[PDB]
Amino acid sequence: FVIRGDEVRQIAPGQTGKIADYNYKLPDDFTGCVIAWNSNNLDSK
Amino acid sequence: AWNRKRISNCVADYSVLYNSASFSTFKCYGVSPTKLNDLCFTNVYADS
Amino acid sequence: SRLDKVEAEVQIDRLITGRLQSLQTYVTQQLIRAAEIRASANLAATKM
């Protein structure tokens, strides 16, 4: 997906936040990896 | 000259306090933040 | 009441460890006492 970078800290197992509260959240038993990169070069509009 | 303040006799809806996304950091030591809205406090002080 | 599950887990683990170690101590020491009482009982039966 694509999202704001400020709430990226919320998107992680164990962590919480408004995005984790009601936007989307991975559970604390997460089995995988989380990668992200800034895309302001192309997603700007 | 960091300020001292006492807070007493108030209903504190910490959910609305959390609603302020402008707060860059929000850390709670003795309790989990979500639990704030479900507990009382016999003594509350603030520093600014 | 005051903590979340991930945050609570460490404290719960320490509580569990301490309590069950106490139970181990109580069990073994009681069993030793039971051994002494058993020997005394055999002495009593022989006396009778």
Q: What chains are in contact with B, requiring at least 3 Cβ pairs below 8 Å?
A: A, C
- DSSP 3-state assignment of C5? helix
Other CB atoms within 10 A of residue A17 CB:
20
Rounded Cα distance between A27 and A40, Å, is: 28
Rounded Cα distance between B31 and C7, Å, is: 9
Give the CA angle between residues A24, A26, A31 to the nearest 5°.
Answer: 155
Beta bridge partners of B8: none
Name the resolution in angstroms.
Answer: 4.5
Q: What chains are in contact with A, requiring at least 3 Cβ pairs below 8 Å?
A: B, C
Q: Which amino acid is at C19?
A: R
Q: How was this structure determined?
A: cryo-EM
User: In chain B, which residues have their Cβ closer than 8 Å to the Cβ of C7?
Assistant: 32
Rounded Cα distance between C27 and A19, Å, is: 51
Rounded Cα distance between B24 and B46, Å, is: 18
Query: Two tokens at A10?
Result: 């919320």
Pair B30, C1: CB distance under 8 Å? no
